Design a protein around this ligand. Structure first.
Ligand SMILES: OC[C@H]1O[C@H](O[C@H]2[C@H](O)[C@@H](O)[C@@H](O)O[C@@H]2CO)[C@H](O)[C@@H](O)[C@@H]1O
Ligand SMILES: OC[C@H]1O[C@H](O[C@H]2[C@H](O)[C@@H](O)[C@@H](O)O[C@@H]2CO)[C@H](O)[C@@H](O)[C@@H]1O
Ligand SMILES: OC[C@H]1O[C@H](O[C@H]2[C@H](O)[C@@H](O)[C@@H](O)O[C@@H]2CO)[C@H](O)[C@@H](O)[C@@H]1O
Ligand SMILES: OC[C@H]1O[C@H](O[C@H]2[C@H](O)[C@@H](O)[C@H](O)O[C@@H]2CO)[C@H](O)[C@@H](O)[C@@H]1O
Ligand SMILES: [Ca+2]
Ligand SMILES: [Ca+2]
Ligand SMILES: [Ca+2]
Length: 686
């Protein structure tokens, strides 16, 4: 379906309470009375935006070029205050994952918005927050709701009556946010003076409950999810949850793995997650550099190109990275740099670069504001004539129509500290983009080379951002002047004469799932699709999109190929799992002594466990881990494995110097749980 890939889309991120109040009657419900501020002066209270308000502004969003709305969390949040004028208006403090937040509407309202968005050709992804329930103080159960969790109104438990349930972790507050065990098993804290009750995704009831709640959003039409705080809960559950969701529908998943940029200690773990979990990630690596290049001017275009190259080498599916200039957790771009041309340039960069852009609501209306909560002001106007509105609409159309933006390679063609001219290319489709961030200097551009075919090219933006026309002859662009602060875009597209795969999505699943192949040149007459040479059953076949069912074949990463008119396409990978997954805590007791830098990994006889690999790079299906060691010399971590299956596995130490020390003896043998979760505990064999 169209939900599988968002490569041709523009994502628009909406903080529901601060967008549009389409129904004033749900502003201050009796269920959660007293959390509403009609004056819009108390920044952490509900101001009244809702799901009906989003639905009423669909014509505006369609005209802007939005093709996927990322809705901030829609599920029932804390019904009380959490300290002085502080409320769950943002949606990250969930008390009931089965019900829509009453300030925003009910399930009928959600269905109506989603159905109306789909009628307007716009998808809806939902921000889903599995890490925690609500604010609590460990020494006082009367604060807020004490972390209370409900199941469609039926009370489940809170932080204080959990002794015989184990729905929450009880390990204290995070102290070192970069310590992986703390970041996942200790509590998320808020500087306002409280902690968030940390759900135990290792508890079977909670894992199935969260799975059911995510599946319910998809059953109600959601086209995918933006999964909150994926660095804060075990990554086995991210992969097992993604499995369940792709069994339901070929939706799109992206996880927010905050920070951990290149060169940092936990960066490789984030890359491995993006490459193996079945969940794509938001592009924090590129965001940092975009803000320093176009915002603070502390980095240059060389740093921007270096980050495009570095992310391109690390992420297997870099075209699934979700890019952004700002969001609800950092100051708005215009509070970093109020120059609107620099904002226009940053927007053009993400609109034409690899991955799919996410534009934070109101960017196109020139909203400004410091960090949370001041970057969550009310959408001020719905003016369709701003330069930013016109730019986004125009470039969104280029992204929908030119395959080079969706799937293309990226090549640097001209660069200095201020100017970046890069080229996207997908077979014969080419887009050459020139950006000059310096608003006070023009540059003479000579020696520019391109893959554009011969001819004269007008700026696709029609000079909106100061762009100019160019003349191309045998791969050479005639010398021209790039104006101060300008953005200029030159493009070529044509029909394909052979099958060309731009995307296969989702990137993981089991036999029988629906998988979508997006591209060009498939023809109108049905041809064939193979996975590793195995013929797949075709569900639908069009010139640019094929839907297939994953064949009942052996598990592992395999190559998808399209054959049309006797000619075969390029290959694109797809990870076939060994069966529906379960998320399992693997513990190895009494392992041998280690030194700082030495880490233990798990490997075994299935692709989920690496097929006996000892490789620990960003590759797909290699050794699993590393394990953590809060209970050293015992080590543990949580991994997604096929449910109800007998597996063989061993652990190994990867010393700081790269040396490998395997457990001795015979392989450990175990049968995995049949439910959502379970535990497999063994003793290191000496
Ligand atoms: O109470 C802590 C914090 O909760 C929310 O922050 C989110 C953030 O917006 C997400 O993007 C991610 O980083 O996880 C956090 C917890 O879900 C609120 O948005 C923030 O105001 C509040 O301080
Ligand atoms: O002519 C091919 C050459 O083009 C570009 O080099 C630019 C350089 O980026 C600018 O800073 C300036 O010095 O003009 C040069 C062209 O004369 C590419 O960046 C380079 O890779 C390529 O070889
Ligand atoms: O390479 C496949 C092989 O991997 C594992 O064998 C390990 C063994 O456990 C270690 O003790 C040491 O001998 O290295 C071997 C890998 O070279 C599995 O145990 C074995 O079943 C599997 O075939
Ligand atoms: O400031 C709120 C954010 O806190 C955390 O961010 C951590 C980050 O994970 C860690 O890598 C860095 O070293 O420290 C910061 C701040 O303590 C959360 O992970 C974010 O989601 C929050 O927005
Ligand atoms: Ca309202
Ligand atoms: Ca509520
Ligand atoms: Ca957690």
């Amino acid at each position: 379906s169209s939900s599988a890939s968002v490569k041709g889309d523009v994502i628009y991120q909406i903080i529901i309470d601060r967008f549009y109040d389409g129904d004033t009657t749900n502003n201050n419900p009796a269920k959660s009375y007293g959390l509403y501020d009609p004056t819009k002066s108390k920044w952490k209270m509900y101001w009244g935006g809702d799901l009906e308000g989003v639905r009423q502004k669909l014509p505006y969003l369609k005209q802007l070029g939005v093709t996927t709305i990322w809705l901030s969390p829609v599920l029932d949040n804390l019904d009380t205050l959490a300290g002085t004028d502080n409320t769950g208006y943002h949606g990250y403090w969930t008390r009931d994952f089965k019900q829509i937040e009453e300030h925003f509407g009910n399930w009928t309202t959600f269905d109506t918005l989603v159905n109306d968005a789909h009628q307007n050709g716009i998808k809806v992804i939902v921000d889903f927050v599995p890490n925690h329930s609500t604010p609590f103080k460990a020494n006082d159960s009367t604060f807020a709701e004490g972390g209370a969790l409900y199941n469609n109104g039926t009370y489940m438990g809170n932080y204080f009556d959990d002794a015989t349930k184990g729905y929450f972790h009880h390990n204290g507050d995070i102290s070192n946010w970069d310590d992986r065990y703390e970041a996942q098993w200790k509590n998320f804290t808020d500087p306002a003076g409280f902690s968030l009750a940390d759900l135990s995704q290792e508890n079977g009831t909670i894992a199935q409950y969260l799975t059911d709640a995510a599946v319910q959003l998809v059953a109600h039409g959601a086209d995918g999810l933006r999964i909150d705080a994926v660095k804060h809960f075990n990554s086995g559950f991210s992969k097992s949850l993604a499995d369940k969701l792709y069994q339901k529908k070929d939706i799109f998943l992206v996880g927010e793995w905050y920070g951990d940029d290149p060169g940092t200690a936990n960066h490789l773990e984030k890359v491995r997650y993006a490459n193996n979990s079945g969940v794509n990630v938001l592009d924090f690596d590129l965001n940092t550099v975009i803000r320093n290049v176009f915002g603070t001017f502390t980095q240059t275009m060389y740093d921007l190109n270096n980050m495009v190259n570095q992310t391109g080498n690390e992420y297997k599916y870099k075209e699934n990275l979700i890019t952004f200039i700002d969001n609800h957790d950092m100051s708005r771009f215009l509070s970093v740099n109020s120059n609107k041309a620099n904002l226009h340039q940053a927007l053009a960069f993400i609109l034409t670069s690899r991955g799919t852009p996410s534009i934070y609501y109101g960017t196109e209306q020139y909203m400004a504001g410091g960090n949370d909560p001041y970057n969550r002001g009310m959408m001020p106007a719905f003016d369709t004539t701003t330069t930013a509105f016109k730019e986004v609409s125009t470039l969104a159309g280029l992204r929908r129509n030119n395959a080079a933006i969706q799937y293309g390679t990226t090549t640097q063609r001209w660069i200095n500290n201020d100017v970046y001219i890069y080229e996207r290319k997908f077979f014969n489709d080419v887009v050459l983009v020139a950006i000059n961030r310096n608003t006070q200097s023009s540059y003479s551009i000579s020696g520019l080379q391109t893959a554009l075919p011969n001819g004269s090219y007008a700026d696709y933006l029609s000079g909106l951002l100061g762009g100019n026309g160019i003349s191309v002859s045998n791969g050479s662009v005639a010398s021209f002047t790039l104006a101060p602060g300008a953005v200029s875009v030159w493009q070529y597209s044509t029909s394909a004469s052979a099958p060309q795969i731009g995307s296969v999505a989702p990137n993981m699943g089991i036999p029988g799932n629906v998988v979508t192949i997006d591209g060009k040149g498939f023809g109108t007459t049905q041809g064939t699709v193979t996975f590793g040479g195995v013929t797949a059953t075709v569900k639908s076949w069009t010139s640019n999109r094929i839907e297939v069912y994953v064949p009942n074949m052996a598990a592992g990463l395999t190559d998808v190929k399209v054959t049309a008119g006797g000619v075969s396409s390029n290959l694109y990978s797809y990870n076939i799992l060994s069966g529906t997954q379960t998320s399992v805590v693997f513990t190895v007791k009494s392992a041998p002594p280690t030194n700082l830098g030495d880490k233990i990994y798990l490997t075994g006889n299935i692709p989920e466990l690496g097929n006996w690999s000892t490789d620990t790079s960003g590759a797909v299906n290699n050794a699993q881990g590393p394990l953590l060691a809060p209970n050293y010399p015992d080590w543990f971590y949580v991994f997604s494995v096929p449910a109800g299956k007998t597996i063989q596995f061993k652990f190994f130490i990867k010393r700081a110097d790269g040396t490998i020390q395997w457990e001795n003896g015979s392989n450990h043998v175990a049968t995995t749980p049949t439910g959502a979760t379970g535990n497999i505990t063994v003793t290191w064999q000496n």
